[PDB]
Structures are given as structure tokens and as C-alpha cells.
Design a protein around this motif. Structure first.
Motif, short mmCIF file in Angstrom:
data_model
loop_
_atom_site.label_atom_id
_atom_site.label_comp_id
_atom_site.label_asym_id
_atom_site.label_seq_id
_atom_site.Cartn_x
_atom_site.Cartn_y
_atom_site.Cartn_z
N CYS A 33 46.73 52.98 58.93
CA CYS A 33 47.73 52.03 59.38
C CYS A 33 47.98 51.04 58.25
N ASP A 34 49.25 50.79 57.95
CA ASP A 34 49.59 49.76 56.99
C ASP A 34 51.02 49.30 57.26
N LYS A 35 51.31 48.04 56.92
CA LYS A 35 52.68 47.54 57.04
C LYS A 35 53.54 47.97 55.87
N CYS A 53 52.66 50.48 60.57
CA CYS A 53 52.31 49.61 61.68
C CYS A 53 51.92 48.26 61.12
N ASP A 54 52.60 47.23 61.59
CA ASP A 54 52.26 45.84 61.32
C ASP A 54 51.40 45.35 62.47
N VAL A 55 50.12 45.05 62.20
CA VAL A 55 49.21 44.69 63.28
C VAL A 55 49.58 43.40 63.98
N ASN A 93 39.09 47.27 61.71
CA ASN A 93 40.10 46.22 61.60
C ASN A 93 39.91 45.57 60.23
N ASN A 94 40.60 46.11 59.22
CA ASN A 94 40.51 45.64 57.84
C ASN A 94 41.73 44.83 57.41
N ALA A 95 42.91 45.07 57.98
CA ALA A 95 44.11 44.33 57.58
C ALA A 95 43.87 42.83 57.63
N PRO A 97 42.14 27.38 56.13
CA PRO A 97 42.62 28.33 57.14
C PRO A 97 41.95 29.70 57.04
N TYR A 98 41.77 30.23 55.83
CA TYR A 98 41.16 31.56 55.67
C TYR A 98 39.75 31.58 56.22
N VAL A 99 38.93 30.61 55.79
CA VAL A 99 37.55 30.49 56.28
C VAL A 99 37.52 30.43 57.80
N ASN A 132 32.86 39.11 46.94
CA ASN A 132 33.90 39.45 45.96
C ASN A 132 33.97 40.96 45.75
N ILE A 133 35.06 41.57 46.20
CA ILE A 133 35.32 43.00 46.00
C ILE A 133 36.57 43.13 45.13
N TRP A 134 36.47 43.88 44.04
CA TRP A 134 37.61 44.07 43.15
C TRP A 134 38.66 44.94 43.82
N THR A 135 39.80 44.32 44.15
CA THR A 135 40.91 44.90 44.89
C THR A 135 42.23 44.36 44.35
N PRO A 136 43.37 44.93 44.76
CA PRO A 136 44.65 44.39 44.33
C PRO A 136 44.87 42.94 44.74
N1 LIG Z 1 38.71 41.52 48.23
C1 LIG Z 1 37.68 40.71 48.58
O1 LIG Z 1 36.97 40.15 47.73
C2 LIG Z 1 37.43 40.43 50.06
C3 LIG Z 1 36.26 39.74 50.37
C4 LIG Z 1 35.90 39.55 51.69
C5 LIG Z 1 36.71 40.03 52.69
N2 LIG Z 1 37.85 40.68 52.37
C6 LIG Z 1 38.74 41.18 53.48
O2 LIG Z 1 38.91 42.57 53.32
C7 LIG Z 1 40.20 42.94 53.87
C8 LIG Z 1 40.97 43.72 52.84
O3 LIG Z 1 41.18 42.87 51.68
P1 LIG Z 1 41.65 43.50 50.29
O4 LIG Z 1 41.10 42.70 49.17
O5 LIG Z 1 41.44 44.97 50.34
O6 LIG Z 1 43.21 43.21 50.43
P2 LIG Z 1 44.51 43.95 49.87
O7 LIG Z 1 45.56 42.91 49.89
O8 LIG Z 1 44.19 44.60 48.53
O9 LIG Z 1 44.79 45.09 50.92
C9 LIG Z 1 45.14 44.72 52.27
C10 LIG Z 1 45.94 45.84 52.89
O10 LIG Z 1 46.31 45.43 54.23
C11 LIG Z 1 47.70 45.59 54.40
N3 LIG Z 1 48.19 44.65 55.40
C12 LIG Z 1 48.45 43.32 55.23
N4 LIG Z 1 49.00 42.74 56.28
C13 LIG Z 1 49.10 43.77 57.20
C14 LIG Z 1 49.65 43.83 58.51
N5 LIG Z 1 50.23 42.78 59.14
N6 LIG Z 1 49.61 45.02 59.15
C15 LIG Z 1 49.08 46.07 58.52
N7 LIG Z 1 48.56 46.14 57.29
C16 LIG Z 1 48.60 44.95 56.68
C17 LIG Z 1 48.30 45.41 53.01
O11 LIG Z 1 49.61 45.98 52.93
C18 LIG Z 1 47.26 46.13 52.14
O12 LIG Z 1 47.54 47.52 52.01
C19 LIG Z 1 40.85 41.64 54.37
O13 LIG Z 1 40.56 41.41 55.75
C20 LIG Z 1 40.13 40.57 53.54
O14 LIG Z 1 40.09 39.31 54.20
C21 LIG Z 1 38.22 40.88 51.09
#
Ligand SMILES: NC(=O)c1ccc[n+]([C@@H]2O[C@H](COP(=O)([O-])OP(=O)(O)OC[C@H]3O[C@@H](n4cnc5c(N)ncnc54)[C@H](O)[C@@H]3O)[C@@H](O)[C@H]2O)c1
Ligand SMILES: NC(=O)c1ccc[n+]([C@@H]2O[C@H](COP(=O)([O-])OP(=O)(O)OC[C@H]3O[C@@H](n4cnc5c(N)ncnc54)[C@H](O)[C@@H]3O)[C@@H](O)[C@H]2O)c1
Ligand SMILES: NC(=O)c1ccc[n+]([C@@H]2O[C@H](COP(=O)([O-])OP(=O)(O)OC[C@H]3O[C@@H](n4cnc5c(N)ncnc54)[C@H](O)[C@@H]3O)[C@@H](O)[C@H]2O)c1
Ligand SMILES: NC(=O)c1ccc[n+]([C@@H]2O[C@H](COP(=O)([O-])OP(=O)(O)OC[C@H]3O[C@@H](n4cnc5c(N)ncnc54)[C@H](O)[C@@H]3O)[C@@H](O)[C@H]2O)c1
Ligand SMILES: O=C(c1ccc(F)c(O)c1)c1cccc(-c2ccc(O)c(O)c2)n1
Ligand SMILES: O=C(c1ccc(F)c(O)c1)c1cccc(-c2ccc(O)c(O)c2)n1
Ligand SMILES: O=C(c1ccc(F)c(O)c1)c1cccc(-c2ccc(O)c(O)c2)n1
Ligand SMILES: O=C(c1ccc(F)c(O)c1)c1cccc(-c2ccc(O)c(O)c2)n1
Ligand SMILES: OC[C@H]1O[C@H](O)[C@H](O)[C@@H](O)[C@@H]1O
Ligand SMILES: OC[C@H]1O[C@H](O)[C@H](O)[C@@H](O)[C@@H]1O
Ligand SMILES: OC[C@H]1O[C@H](O)[C@H](O)[C@@H](O)[C@@H]1O
Ligand SMILES: OC[C@H]1O[C@H](O)[C@H](O)[C@@H](O)[C@@H]1O
Ligand code: NA
Ligand code: NA
Ligand code: NA
Ligand code: NA
Lengths: 255, 255, 255, 255
Positions: free
Chosen positions: C35-37, C57-59, C84-86, C149-151, C182-186
């Protein structure tokens, strides 16, 4: 005289925990602004307590809160402590009986009303090196049955307290929370009255604590006065006022 | 007069945090027995503070502790609060440089001395509905580098506090701990002096807290007086006096 | 074959942590609904991975989520796990620069989208004795600067996980969360690019962990597969995937 | 093959949780050294499991542990994981019925035996970038009645795990613990048999978990294999395997 010359705002101060906090701060020498959306309890408290005044204010209404802050400064000249106590526990509700709508409404009170008052007060708290005290709940930390929205809101408050403590530490403003357990209040009495056996519900509630009783508003009030007046190296803490409910095994072979 | 008519024993009360606790309880109206294995600081404190007396006692020596309790009862007629503060942090030590022997010796002081005094005092605390306050450490909860034995002992104290709170709750005796962070004391000064750059060590120590300073013995003392005198619904809690050190990310791409 | 024959929905599965979770579940033998928006990443993943399919799908949109669940059941006949990762982290924002409006919008995504999918999925999870995995954050537990807000939203998710675990335990449905650091992500890359010195920001981010690097999506994915497939006595836990960031003192005399 | 080619030592591996961990690592492709002070169970396990061998070793005896490590290296050429599971829970004991002597003896097993093996193994774990898994207990975190010494020892293990994780992180060695709740084992069976009503004791023990059953050794074993083989960004964590016992209010008006 532990907090003499200081000015304190207590939200939801007209009854329950909030009224206990009001009384504790008055007893400590502070001037107290009682904020409540209801007039009945808070107006009587103002008549009873020299040093306390009542201001009608619904913390979910931003213009109400703006007026609360400006009137406190207009009348008393300073602001030292904000106690975000206003909040509500809905009746027990199974997860599938909750709604996104009710969840949003509970977030408006329990979380965003605390956010809004804190935001508007912080410029004045910076001038006074004052502090913020949020009333969260033990169940934000350990969970509770039939209370998904409520638990969620209190997890948010406790977490927010820590975030804001970090942001405000360079400016000398401490931000802490109190997490009560079962405290005998009008809300506890109202919810018990809905249950099929209210007396069994209250008995269960007393016995959920190792101390074998519920807590009193005055005990939460004392913890709040401590945090305001004597805890000058505490910021971002969660002070538990629970009677030990979180300790040990209770009522909650390997197949 | 918050704790007037009460009798308090503070171990390691001759300097540092313990001396701050002694002063706080004297200021609250209590009579205080200063226990220390060293005479220098505690004897001077007795001369300085009406209401405080010094008793030489090494908490690792069971007969010393037995005499401490019997002399407190003989001289003052009651016992309301025991503050188990005596303890030590060794110099920084890599895991492979520690020994089972040194580990056992540190357990004798930091953990078993607290156990022994508490045991001998509890019959009198039951009569007075008194309480126990253990001085643990933040690093029992979050760890610390180069300190495996010390961390282990403080994890034990915090855990023990919760176990004993459960056991003593039916009898009305509360059992709580305080977990300080960096508090400026003679021990902090001594350890910093061993480091190659003592000034850098102290600077790092001040900056490990969001508040940007170390804490004071008087701030730990205030938290202890709160727990003794006003926290009547708190048992088994860990009260953090840390300046926010445990909050947020610090100095501690995915390959 | 650790999770063969099972059906998993991963929200926000098109990139980042979510994509790592998708890959981990595919590798475990499961069929996965991404699922992704956004279409870009998730559609490519579907072409790449046999066993994964993409559903736009936009959650935050209830009818989108209703369709996600009904289409999963229509296409695959069962539902065993919802991840539930979004979610989103806004740019760093001082408390006074935040708004109630932005706060509400972030709650809609990070908290209520997780609530909504979980609610709609739970009847099917009950039939399969399946489970829920929420992706929270370490900073819900310890706070973070410039992120009130995030916290707050992540404190809510962690707390909600425990409440729902209690409610769903009689029905055999486990509910757990993962709290990454901290996870290396976009997202990490995008936020760093806004900072005045992006390279310093990334360097600080690697060094906030004792392990000295950031984590990988694949490591979060492994923890999710563990929770789904092998953690049959775990419910209401917060599994930390942080590289030790929460341990010890860092960069965050008594006057 | 999740942990193929690896060498694992499990202390107290002859029965109970330890035997479940042995079986889980054998099933993962590892070679396992079963350490136990008793021959009966561990020798039978060696005959049953290809890939497991038994070495008689009392972890409280330093020369026994030295031989355990040297024999593991002599026979298998490497050492990748040490699981410190050996430990004991005494019968329920009121605080005043405990002794400093019994407390010291329990620290020797539950805490110092874990310390000793870890110390002797760490040079080899550094060479292999291996890891340490300590078996602590939920009650180190939340307390337990009639168990002051036991609780103290498990608070120490959990704290020590975090300290050692910090010290060993620069060298690539992760250090984690598992905190089980009620797990059906021969120890659980033995203690229940001492109680006046053993069946009531077991019933209470099953119902202390929201899941309504006790856990199995195999479930602790799976968590251990996860921590060894797939948790490469986890260090200093406490993995709870408790069935949710720590969640919510149980059996543990304001006067
Ligand atoms: N990267 C980190 O260091 C980190 C640390 C702790 C927690 N997190 C959490 O991990 C999760 C993923 O983070 P990430 O770094 O992979 O982010 P990301 O921005 O790289 O990826 C998030 C994905 O979710 C999608 N998304 C966003 N809004 C959406 C919606 N309304 N409906 C459906 N899909 C939606 C985006 O399009 C994207 O593909 C988040 O909940 C974030 O809070 C991340
Ligand atoms: N009673 C307990 O056992 C318990 C336990 C843990 C936490 N708490 C928390 O303590 C706080 C007080 O609870 P209580 O039991 O005293 O409740 P209560 O219902 O007895 O009193 C709450 C007060 O807040 C006021 N209030 C409600 N909504 C308001 C609004 N929008 N604006 C202004 N005032 C408003 C009410 O009119 C009332 O006077 C709440 O945040 C609650 O979540 C209570
Ligand atoms: N200073 C800090 O930053 C810090 C932080 C967290 C916790 N603590 C804890 O606070 C307590 C006090 O530490 P401090 O910094 O004040 O130390 P300190 O060394 O300055 O003072 C300790 C006092 O205890 C006494 N003492 C030592 N061994 C004793 C024994 N066997 N019997 C009786 N008295 C004994 C010493 O003589 C001294 O007077 C300790 O338990 C320590 O672990 C300190
Ligand atoms: N069973 C539970 O509910 C439970 C809950 C939480 C934690 N734990 C912990 O799990 C571990 C295992 O407990 P269990 O229930 O499997 O116990 P158990 O008594 O069934 O098995 C323990 C094993 O360790 C061995 N052992 C004891 N002392 C030893 C020594 N000095 N040297 C070597 N081996 C020794 C015993 O001979 C036995 O084979 C312990 O650390 C215990 O504290 C158990
Ligand atoms: O307001 C209540 C409360 C109770 C405890 C708390 F920690 C808290 O934050 C709030 C309360 C009062 C009376 C009954 C209940 C209650 C009882 C059973 C329930 O399932 C439930 O969700 C709530 N809660
Ligand atoms: O006594 C100290 C202390 C510091 C903080 C604590 F929470 C605590 O319980 C004790 C202290 C004082 C000065 C330096 C240090 C210290 C510095 C570097 C270290 O690696 C270390 O193990 C300890 N600790
Ligand atoms: O998305 C981020 C993140 C980082 C860590 C987390 F635990 C988390 O849940 C989210 C992230 C990425 C890059 C930089 C930052 C960041 C840096 C400085 C800040 O003040 C801030 O609020 C966030 N956060
Ligand atoms: O070994 C036991 C145990 C139980 C739970 C644990 F988390 C743990 O680390 C150990 C166990 C087994 C059977 C009964 C009991 C027990 C029951 C009542 C008690 O008061 C007590 O201290 C222990 N403990
Ligand atoms: O209504 C329940 C209780 O609420 C508050 O605690 C009041 O102070 C107390 O008088 C009352 O019994
Ligand atoms: O030695 C360091 C410090 O120890 C204690 O805090 C003393 O009260 C203080 O005067 C001194 O500066
Ligand atoms: O964009 C930052 C990182 O995001 C994800 O971790 C990707 O899997 C990785 O390839 C990329 O380097
Ligand atoms: O003795 C109690 C239990 O101990 C262990 O769990 C054994 O694996 C199991 O067969 C037995 O029922
Ligand atoms: Na008045
Ligand atoms: Na004197
Ligand atoms: Na596909
Ligand atoms: Na064999």
C-alpha cells in the motif's frame, strides 16, 4: 510560602484532580487562575479560596485560551506555571465500537488543548523561568483495556512533555508530567455508576494498587507543587502517582 | 515543619549528596542521624546543624548497622525514614580490566549495605508507617561506559526498591528510589581529577544535560524530603533528578 | 518458508523502511500487498517481486483503506498481518513555529491511519489468529528536539499498541510495535538535504548510535518477520531497532 | 541455515528454557555447547541432538568456566554467541526471612556467573563479531512479591547488559537480554509444588498474562536465535517474552 509571589494557571480546576491542584498551589502561597469549561465548581472555589480566581475557558477553543492567557497577565502581571489537567476518559469501549470521529474529539481535549495553552503561555514562562506540568496517566505507559483512544492521547502527552523539555531547556523553562493512577474523583464516580455493578468496579479499582486504596486529588496536588517549586533539576520526567499499580504481576499450561 | 517530629537516618551523610539530604531534612524539622564511615565531614555537620547527630558506621559491617539502628532508637525513640545514600563509583574501567573480586566488593557497598540497613530498620518503620528512600542512579536505567560493575549495582537497587515496595505495602511502609544524574560532589571532583584533561571531563559532564549544568546535592535533598513527607500515594517509583540527560539523541552511512 | 501461505499488508511499502519490510516478508514466503499513496516506487516493486502486488491507497482516506482491505481479501482469501509503516517526519520545527493545524494533519497520518487500517483489518485477523505490527519510533520514548508534533504522534502509537494488545488478546490476535532509531531512507536523505550542512547532519546521525552507523530497512524488515512469524508469546511489546542510541550519556558547574 | 557455521554456548542448557534455546540454535544450523552443573538432562540432550555436545560446568566456579571456553575453542575453532541462561529462583521469601548470605549466593549464580563467562568469552567474540544474550526476567523491571534477592539480581543483569553493550559496540560485539515472564519449566513446576495449593498457583500463573497461558522454552529459544542471527542493529535491548503480563491493571475508597 514555598511558591509565594508566583502565578499559576490550572486547567480543569473546578473539580477532581484539578481542584486538588488549585488548593495545593493556594496553600503554597501562589495566586491561582482556575480555568474550566463549567462554571459550577470553579466559581464556588473562587469564593472559597482567597488567592484563586475563576476564568471560564474551554481549552479546545483557541480564542478562549488566548483570552485566558491575556487576562492572567492583565490581572496578575506574570505567569510562572501552567498545569494542563483538563481531560476526559470516555466510558469503556471495545476497539470496534470506537470511531475516528470520537478519537479526533478526544485528541482535541486531552492533547491539543494542552498543546495550545502551553504554546500561548511559553513566552511569559520564558520571562519568569517558569515551568509546565502536564497531567498524563499511568495507562499511557502500560495500557488499559477498552480505552484505545484514551491511552493513545496520554501516550502522546507523556511523549510531547519530553520533546518540549528538550526544546525549552536552553531557555530555562522546565516541562514535566504527572502520571496518576486511580484517583477518586467525580469522573471515577461517574464511570463506575455506568457499570452493571458499580460497587464491584470501585472495589476492583481500590485493589489494583498495592497500597489497597485509590489516590486523592491532594496527593496529585502535592506532586505538582513539588515539580513547580522544588524540582529545579527535573525536566522531561514522568512522576508516577499510582499507589504502585504498575508493579508486579496481577490478574490480566503453556498451550 | 513539613517533617517535624520525625527521625531520619542518612547513610553516607558526611559529604556530597548525603550531606545535602541531611541538610534538607533538618530544614524540614526532622532529627537526623548522619551515618558515615569517615568522621571528618559528618562530625563537622553535627556541630553545624542543631538537630543532626553523627554516628560512625560502615554500612558493609553488619554489627555497625545493628548499632546504628539501636542507637537511633535509644536516643530518639522512633524511626521514620531511612535514606540509603552510601555508595561509590570506581574509576572508569574497561570490562576486561574489572574483576569478580572488585565486583563483589562494590555489590557489598552499593547493594548489600542498603539491603542490610533496610532490613534492620523495617520493624521500626512499620511501627511509624515510615518509608525507605534508596539513592540509585540514572545509569542503572540507561547504562554507562567503562562502568559494568557500578551500573549492575544500581540496576539492582532500582529493581530491589520495587520488590520491597510490593512486600511492604500491606504494612503501610513505602519504598522509593531517587536516580540522580551528574551531581557536582567530591566524588565527581575526585574522578575528574584522574582524567588526563579534568576540565574537559567536567565540561562534558555539564553538557550531558539539556539544562547545561550539573545538579546540586540540595536538589536531591528536596526530592528526598518530598518522597518522605508528601508522596503518600508513591511507592516503588524511580524519581529522576538528572537535568534531562536521558532525553533525546546525543554523541554516543548504514554500512 | 517461515511465513509461507500467509498474506501481509504493508502500508507505505513503496520505499524506505516499508520497502525493506515488503522484501523481508516476500523472502519469508508470504504474499504481500504493498500500500502506498505514491505509484512510482510501489509499482516497480510489484514488477520486481513475485508474490508482491501494489494497491494505491492513502491511509488518511477511509474509503481508500476500506478498498485496500476488501481487495486484499478478494484477491488472496485471507489476511494474516498488517504492518502500519506509513508515516512522515516534518522538517525540524521550533515549538513556536508549529501549528495546531499541522499537528492535526500529522496525527491523521501517523496515528489515525494506523488506527483505521487496524480497525478494518481486525475481523479478518481474528479469523486467521493474525497480528498487527506498528512502526513507531525511539523518539516517542525518549523525545527529540524540534519535533513536538512528531514525537507526540509516536508516543500515541506506542501507547495505542499496548491498549489494543490488551483488547485483542482474548481473541488470539497479537499487537506489537517496532521503534526504529536512525534508519537510512529517502526521508532521512530528504531532511538532511534541507539542513545548512547536510554532510554534518548525516555524520551526526551515524554517530548518535554506539554502533556508529545508521540502520537499514532490511534490519527493520527482519524484526517485523520475527514479530509476525516467531514471537507467539509477544504482545504489546516495543521492539527497539536503534543501534543503542538510547543507551548512556551523550551531548545534549552546578550553577 | 539462519546460523549455519556458528558456535553457541548455552549455560544451564540441560532442561527448561536453556534446553529450548539449545534446540532452537541446533535447528538454526549452529553447533551448540550445552553447559550445565547437572549431567542428567544435558547428557541426554547431547545424545538426542546431532550438533550439540555437553560440557559439565558450574558457572559459579571460575576454573570450570575457563575450561568451558578453552574446550569450546579446542573442539570447534570459534565462538559466536554466549547465552547466559543458568540461574535460579528461590522459593517465595518474605523480606525479613532473607539473609545477606543467601543474597550473596544468588548473586554468585544469577549475576556473577553471567559476568564471568562473558568476560572469558569476549576475546573470541571480538574475533568473530559475535554476540552475548543474557536471560534476565520481567520482574527485574516491574518487581515481584516475596523475591527481593531474585528481583535484585535480574535488575542487575538487565542493567549490566546495557553497560556492556556500550563498552563492546566499538568492537562490533552486540550484547542483549531477553526478559521472560512465566515460562512453563521444571523450576516453575518445582516451586508450584511447594505451595499449599499447587493447582491454584499454576492457574494464577497462567492468568497473569493477557494471552491466558504461560510461555514455552521454544518461544524463548526463537527470540534468542533472532537476537543472534537477524538483529544486527540491536544492542543493549531488553526483549520481553511475557505474554503481555506487564500491560494494564490487575489484582495487586481513597482513605
Ligand atoms: N527513517 C528513520 O530514521 C525512521 C526512524 C524511526 C521511525 N521511522 C518511521 O518509519 C516509517 C517509514 O519512514 P521512512 O524513513 O521509511 O519514510 P519514507 O518517507 O522514506 O517512506 C514512507 C513511505 O510511506 C508513504 N506514505 C506517506 N504517506 C502515506 C499515506 N498517507 N498513505 C500511504 N502511504 C503513505 C510514502 O509515499 C513512502 O513510500 C514512518 O512511520 C517513520 O515515522 C523512521
Ligand atoms: N481520576 C483518575 O483516576 C485519573 C487517572 C489518571 C489521569 N487522570 C487525568 O487527570 C485529569 C483530571 O481527571 P479527573 O478525574 O479529575 O476528571 P474530572 O472529570 O473529575 O474533572 C475534570 C475537570 O476538567 C474540566 N474540563 C473538561 N473538559 C474541559 C475543557 N474542554 N476545557 C476546560 N476544562 C475542561 C471538567 O469540567 C472538570 O471540572 C484528566 O486529564 C484525566 O485524564 C485521571
Ligand atoms: N555524584 C553523582 O553524580 C551521582 C550520580 C548518581 C548517583 N550517585 C549516588 O549518590 C550517592 C552519593 O554519591 P556522592 O557523589 O555524594 O559520593 P561522595 O563520595 O561524595 O559521598 C559518599 C559518602 O558516603 C560515604 N561512604 C562510603 N562508603 C561508605 C560505607 N561503607 N559506609 C558508610 N558511608 C560510606 C563516604 O565517606 C562519603 O561521605 C552514591 O550512592 C552514588 O552512587 C551519585
Ligand atoms: N521459568 C520462568 O518462568 C522464568 C521467567 C523469567 C526468567 N527465567 C530465567 O530463565 C533461566 C532458566 O530458568 P528455568 O525456569 O529454565 O530454570 P530450570 O531450573 O528449569 O533450569 C535451569 C538450568 O540451569 C542449570 N543450572 C543451575 N545452576 C547452574 C550453575 N551454577 N551452573 C550451570 N548450570 C546451572 C540447572 O541445572 C538447570 O538445568 C533462569 O535465569 C531464570 O531466572 C525463568
Ligand atoms: O477515568 C478513569 C481512569 C482510571 C485510571 C487511569 F489511569 C486513568 O487515566 C483514568 C476510570 C475511572 C473508572 C473506571 C475506569 C475504567 C474501568 C474499566 C475500563 O475498561 C476502562 O477503560 C476504564 N477508568
Ligand atoms: O560518579 C560518577 C557518576 C556519574 C553519573 C552517574 F549517574 C553516576 O551514578 C555516577 C562520575 C563522576 C565523574 C565521572 C564519571 C565517569 C566518567 C566517564 C566514565 O566512563 C565513567 O564510567 C564515569 N562518573
Ligand atoms: O526522520 C527522521 C527521524 C530520525 C530519527 C527517528 F527516530 C525518527 O522517528 C525519525 C530524521 C531524519 C533526518 C533528520 C532528522 C532530524 C534532525 C534534527 C532534528 O531536530 C529533528 O527534529 C529531526 N530526523
Ligand atoms: O521461577 C519463577 C519465576 C516466575 C516469573 C518470573 F518472571 C521469573 O523470573 C521467575 C516462579 C515460578 C513459580 C512461582 C513463582 C513465584 C510465585 C509467587 C511468589 O511470591 C514468588 O516470589 C514467585 N515464581
Ligand atoms: O466524587 C469523588 C471525590 O471527588 C474528589 O476527590 C472530592 O474531593 C471528594 O470529596 C469526592 O469524594
Ligand atoms: O566538591 C564539589 C562540591 O561538592 C558538594 O556539592 C559541595 O556542597 C560543594 O560545595 C562542592 O563544590
Ligand atoms: O535513499 C537512502 C537509502 O534508502 C533506502 O535505504 C534504500 O534501500 C537505499 O538504497 C538508499 O541508499
Ligand atoms: O516441566 C515443565 C515443562 O518443562 C519444559 O517446558 C519441558 O519442555 C516440558 O515438557 C515440561 O512440561
Ligand atoms: Na478567591
Ligand atoms: Na547537631
Ligand atoms: Na509481483
Ligand atoms: Na550430539
Amino acid at each position: 510560602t514555598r511558591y509565594a509571589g508566583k502565578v499559576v494557571v490550572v486547567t480543569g480546576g473546578g473539580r477532581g484532580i484539578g481542584a486538588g491542584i488549585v488548593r495545593a498551589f493556594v496553600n503554597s502561597g501562589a495566586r491561582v487562575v482556575i480555568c474550566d469549561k463549567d462554571e459550577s465548581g470553579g466559581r464556588a472555589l473562587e469564593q472559597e479560596l482567597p488567592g484563586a480566581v475563576f476564568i471560564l475557558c474551554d481549552v479546545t477553543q483557541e480564542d478562549d485560551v488566548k483570552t485566558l492567557v491575556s487576562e492572567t497577565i492583565r490581572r496578575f502581571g506574570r505567569l510562572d506555571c501552567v498545569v494542563n489537567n483538563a481531560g476526559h476518559h470516555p466510558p469503556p469501549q471495545r476497539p470496534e465500537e470506537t470511531s475516528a470521529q470520537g478519537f479526533r474529539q478526544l485528541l482535541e481535549l486531552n492533547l491539543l488543548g494542552t498543546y495550545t495553552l502551553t504554546k500561548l503561555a511559553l513566552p511569559y514562562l520564558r520571562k519568569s523561568q517558569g515551568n509546565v506540568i502536564n497531567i498524563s496517566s499511568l495507562v499511557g505507559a502500560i495500557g488499559q483495556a477498552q480505552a484505545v483512544p484514551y491511552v493513545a492521547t496520554k501516550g502522546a502527552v507523556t511523549a510531547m512533555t519530553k520533546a518540549l523539555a528538550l526544546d525549552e531547556s536552553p531557555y530555562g523553562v522546565r516541562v514535566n508530567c504527572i502520571s496518576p493512577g486511580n484517583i477518586w474523583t467525580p469522573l471515577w464516580e461517574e464511570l463506575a455508576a455506568l457499570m452493571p455493578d458499580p460497587r464491584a468496579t470501585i472495589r476492583e479499582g481500590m485493589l489494583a494498587q498495592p497500597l489497597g486504596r485509590m489516590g486523592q486529588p491532594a496527593e496529585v496536588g502535592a506532586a505538582a507543587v513539588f515539580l513547580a517549586s522544588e524540582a529545579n533539576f527535573c525536566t522531561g520526567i514522568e512522576l508516577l502517582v499510582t499507589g504502585g499499580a504498575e508493579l508486579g504481576y496481577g490478574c490480566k499450561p503453556s498451550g
